[PDB]
């Protein structure tokens, strides 16, 4: 059903990612029409004498070659009749079946046009594949309340490393279901995901407020994620004094025709309880789709300046709330003291299922700290200096015993992976690999296992 391609542009695309550093080339790019085509290719890899590498590529947003299959085959999962949202009286809500390669932006547009429904949990950027985010976590300002995207999926169809198509959920083949979720593509290729949906808000009241005091900033973020009147989105970012560091709190209040008359007072009541700097509240009112697509608008302005297709040495850390104060002193004021955002916001561990493959710190409240800096165009030394700064951040966490965990981990050494997972989780991860991908065919670019 599918076709192997040796088109130079297809090979070049499959040999790069948003990170702009890793460049392992496959022999071919596979364009499937359906799940059975992916099953056929993985099946052939499992049966082959050499056991060539097979990796699914979402939208190629990996930082360090995680979707690359050196001298093997890259499956171009990009997109055919689409399933309509479905109501279930047993689940108490709606769901939608999506192809693993579908972009979240296309999922949103589909569910809105078919009943004004939408996923409850997002990523900041919607030009990411469903299978791609579900293999990591998929995090944004909604995760404190709904959990990451891996906590908002009912079922999957997975093509294992043996080329077998398996339907899994909490009730059917749960070890495969929970293993695949946050599983870094190690146990199979997601060909279908059954996404949880809610009736979509029509509009968003988008607020930003500034802080000079990190203790007040974090205390307000932690209080907001514990909230009943509440914001629907809680993020934050680190700001340089030139418009000394400032912290910007970023919140939203979702509303529709019914709640439009109470939105102004809900916002005012919530804001009155906060300790931001007076006169620093900035507000925007816009459609729900426009808010969700805000990062793609930043992307178009970057592509126009030749500032998008540059190296991205991005670093993402989960930091226990008990160590966040020390983190600001040594990192925001220390390492980074003196191009790209630095995001920071807490989340609730109870919204993360411990049965999944996702690795979070051993604390109920933890922060995501996202160092999203870009190197200068055509300037290799800029990338090198940013890479040294990232190593200084990791050395700082190691040196002060901060139990930080990397999100989208870029580890390569076996002892680094053992340390990342810890003994219990590593044992469960290795046993899943032995069962579902014994020949280590899948997502070898993650650098965890070898044939
Ligand atoms: C580039 C980028 C990334 C990003 C983001 C904004 C930008 C500009 N904003 C994010 C956000 O707000 N929240 C978040 O959680 N992540 C965010 N990201 C990072 C993003 O989640 C990751 O890059 C992730 O990998 C998804 O990106 P993508 O869809 O492009 O997937 P990939 O890079 O090609 O593949 C990643 C790994 O997953 C395996 N894979 C891919 N598809 C599948 C399927 N269908 N089944 C199983 N495994 C799959 C790849 O082989 C690779 O190992
Ligand atoms: O890329 C992210 N946000 C994002 C936010 C803004 Cl305002 C601009 C932006 O511009 C650019 F050019 F794309 F960088 C990106 N987020 C992300 C990335 C990886 C892991 C986790 C995260 C979630 C952190 O909330």
């Amino acid at each position: 059903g599918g076709r192997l391609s040796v088109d130079a542009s297809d090979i070049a695309e499959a040999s790069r990612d948003f990170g702009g550093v890793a460049r392992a080339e496959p022999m071919a790019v596979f364009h499937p029409r359906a799940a059975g085509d992916v099953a056929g290719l993985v099946g052939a890899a499992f049966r082959s004498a050499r056991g060539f590498r097979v990796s699914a590529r979402g939208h190629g947003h990996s930082i360090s070659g995680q979707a690359q299959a050196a001298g093997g085959v890259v499956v171009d999962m990009s997109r055919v009749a689409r399933a309509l949202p479905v109501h279930s009286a047993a689940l108490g809500g709606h769901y939608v079946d999506v192809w693993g390669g579908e972009l979240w932006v296309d999922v949103l547009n589909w569910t809105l046009s078919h009943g004004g429904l939408a996923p409850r949990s997002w990523t900041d950027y919607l030009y990411l594949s469903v299978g791609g985010t579900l293999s990591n976590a998929g995090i944004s300002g909604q995760a404190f309340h709904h959990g990451p995207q891996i906590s908002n999926v009912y079922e999957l169809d997975v093509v294992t490393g043996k080329g077998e198509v398996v339907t899994c959920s909490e009730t059917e083949n749960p070890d495969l279901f929970f293993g695949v979720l946050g599983g870094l593509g190690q146990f199979g290729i997601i060909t279908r995901a059954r996404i949880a949906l809610e009736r979509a808000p029509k509009r968003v009241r988008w607020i930003r407020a500034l802080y000079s005091n990190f203790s007040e900033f974090t205390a307000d973020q932690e209080r907001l994620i514990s909230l009943g009147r509440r914001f629907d989105y809680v993020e934050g970012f680190v700001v340089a004094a030139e418009g000394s560091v400032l912290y910007c709190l970023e919140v939203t209040k979702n509303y529709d025709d019914e709640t439009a008359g109470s939105v102004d007072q809900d916002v005012d009541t919530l804001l009155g309880e906060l300790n931001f700097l007076p006169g620093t509240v900035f507000t925007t009112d816009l459609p729900y789709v426009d808010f969700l697509d805000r990062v793609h608008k930043a992307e178009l302005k970057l592509r126009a300046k030749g500032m998008w297709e540059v190296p991205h040495p991005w670093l993402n850390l989960f930091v226990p709330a008990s160590r966040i104060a020390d983190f600001d002193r040594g990192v925001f004021r220390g390492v980074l003291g003196g191009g790209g955002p630095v995001l920071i916001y807490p989340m609730n561990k109870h919204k993360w299922d411990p049965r999944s493959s996702a690795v979070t710190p051993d604390e109920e409240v933890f922060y995501l700290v996202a160092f999203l800096r870009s190197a200068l165009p055509g300037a290799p030394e800029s990338l090198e200096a940013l890479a040294r700064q990232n190593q200084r951040i990791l050395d700082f966490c190691a040196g002060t015993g901060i139990g930080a965990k990397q999100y989208l981990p870029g580890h390569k050494a076996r002892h680094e992976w053992a340390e990342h997972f810890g003994a219990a989780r590593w044992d469960r991860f290795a046993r899943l690999k032995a069962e579902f991908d014994p020949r280590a065919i899948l997502a070898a670019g993650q650098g965890i296992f070898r044939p």
Side-chain angles (χ1 to χ4, degrees):
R3 59 167 244 273
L4 285 169
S5 174
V6 296
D7 181 339
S9 288
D10 278 7
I11 297 291
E13 204 55 56
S15 296
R16 68 170 247 243
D17 58 26
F18 184 78
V21 182
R23 252 208 85 260
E25 295 185 310
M27 285 197 304
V29 176
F30 183 67
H31 302 275
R33 278 297 299 179
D37 296 347
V38 174
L41 182 88
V42 181
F46 182 64
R47 282 178 263 100
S48 77
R50 59 163 287 203
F52 61 91
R53 293 174 181 209
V54 174
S55 301
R57 180 186 175 273
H59 203 53
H61 261 270
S62 283
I63 295 308
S64 59
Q66 290 97 323
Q68 292 168 9
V73 181
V74 166
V75 182
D76 183 345
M77 294 293 284
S78 75
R79 279 273 172 90
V80 198
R82 288 202 271 176
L84 298 187
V86 166
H87 180 262
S88 169
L91 303 166
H94 303 81
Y95 64 76
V96 69
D97 282 332
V98 308
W99 169 247
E102 210 64 35
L103 302 183
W104 288 101
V105 64
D106 298 326
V107 172
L108 175 61
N109 286 342
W110 185 255
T111 68
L112 284 174
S113 64
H114 294 84
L117 298 160
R120 313 192 279 260
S121 187
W122 296 101
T123 52
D124 294 344
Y125 179 69
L126 306 187
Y127 287 72
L128 299 177
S129 72
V130 167
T133 72
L134 295 181
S135 295
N136 289 288
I139 307 167
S140 185
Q142 305 83 22
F144 78 92
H145 185 257
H146 286 116
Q149 293 181 324
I150 59 174
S151 295
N152 293 277
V153 50
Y154 294 112
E155 184 175 278
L156 308 166
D157 287 344
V158 170
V159 168
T160 73
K162 286 171 176 171
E164 177 187 332
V165 178
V166 182
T167 292
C168 56
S169 65
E170 183 173 2
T171 63
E172 253 180 82
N173 310 107
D175 300 324
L176 183 65
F177 178 71
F178 291 111
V180 166
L181 292 176
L184 313 172
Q186 295 309 296
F187 315 117
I189 292 163
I190 304 165
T191 59
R192 172 177 65 91
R194 181 165 285 190
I195 309 304
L197 304 170
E198 70 180 356
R199 289 257 177 241
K202 306 241 287 179
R203 301 187 70 82
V204 169
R205 192 56 57 74
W206 182 14
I207 306 121
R208 283 176 180 184
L210 296 165
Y211 291 77
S212 57
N213 191 321
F214 191 71
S215 294
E216 306 283 27
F217 170 72
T218 54
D220 275 1
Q221 278 191 326
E222 291 167 34
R223 201 190 56 81
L224 288 177
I225 68 139
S226 77
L227 303 181
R229 202 182 265 108
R230 52 159 256 266
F231 285 113
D232 300 290
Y233 169 113
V234 181
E235 288 200 12
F237 52 98
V238 189
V239 187
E242 60 284 1
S244 190
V245 283
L246 296 173
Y247 313 96
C248 181
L249 171 69
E250 180 186 66
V251 291
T252 77
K253 189 68 183 162
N254 284 343
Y255 72 99
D256 57 24
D257 297 316
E258 287 157 10
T259 53
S262 54
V263 67
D264 287 81
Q265 203 49 54
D266 288 339
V267 167
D268 277 0
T269 306
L270 287 167
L271 290 182
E273 285 162 80
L274 305 176
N275 312 310
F276 50 82
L277 295 162
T280 71
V281 178
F282 303 94
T283 306
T284 304
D285 190 272
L286 76 172
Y288 186 54
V289 181
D290 282 46
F291 171 74
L292 296 174
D293 212 52
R294 73 202 173 286
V295 177
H296 179 71
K297 291 168 219 282
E299 169 191 359
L300 294 164
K301 292 176 179 176
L302 286 160
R303 283 186 183 271
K305 298 175 189 174
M307 303 219 283
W308 181 260
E309 277 180 48
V310 296
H312 294 99
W314 285 6
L315 171 61
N316 302 282
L317 293 170
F318 290 140
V319 177
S322 78
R323 299 304 298 279
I324 206 67
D326 272 25
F327 199 93
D328 173 60
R329 190 173 174 277
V331 178
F332 306 144
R333 301 168 183 275
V335 180
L336 314 173
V342 173
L343 311 196
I344 174 163
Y345 56 92
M347 272 165 286
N348 294 300
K349 187 182 178 86
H350 76 267
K351 312 272 49 269
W352 292 69
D353 201 306
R355 292 170 288 180
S356 90
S357 279
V359 179
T360 70
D362 301 317
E363 229 169 85
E364 194 33 60
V365 181
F366 58 94
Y367 284 77
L368 166 61
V369 187
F371 302 93
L372 309 180
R373 285 100 28 87
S374 308
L376 290 168
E381 70 286 2
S382 182
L383 168 65
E384 293 164 358
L386 289 173
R388 281 193 298 278
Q389 278 209 327
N390 286 342
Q391 191 57 55
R392 287 201 287 273
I393 297 166
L394 295 179
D395 289 348
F396 168 78
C397 295
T400 60
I402 295 171
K405 297 292 189 184
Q406 276 191 41
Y407 174 51
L408 315 173
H411 309 298
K412 252 85 205 176
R414 191 71 151 222
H415 78 277
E416 287 162 350
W417 286 110
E419 173 62 31
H420 171 78
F421 287 101
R425 286 178 172 276
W426 176 258
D427 190 77
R428 177 174 74 185
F429 203 80
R431 288 177 182 277
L432 284 158
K433 191 79 183 179
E435 174 88 323
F436 298 112
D437 188 22
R439 301 195 64 201
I441 282 147
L442 302 170
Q446 292 272 0
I448 313 168
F449 298 99
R450 246 81 205 180

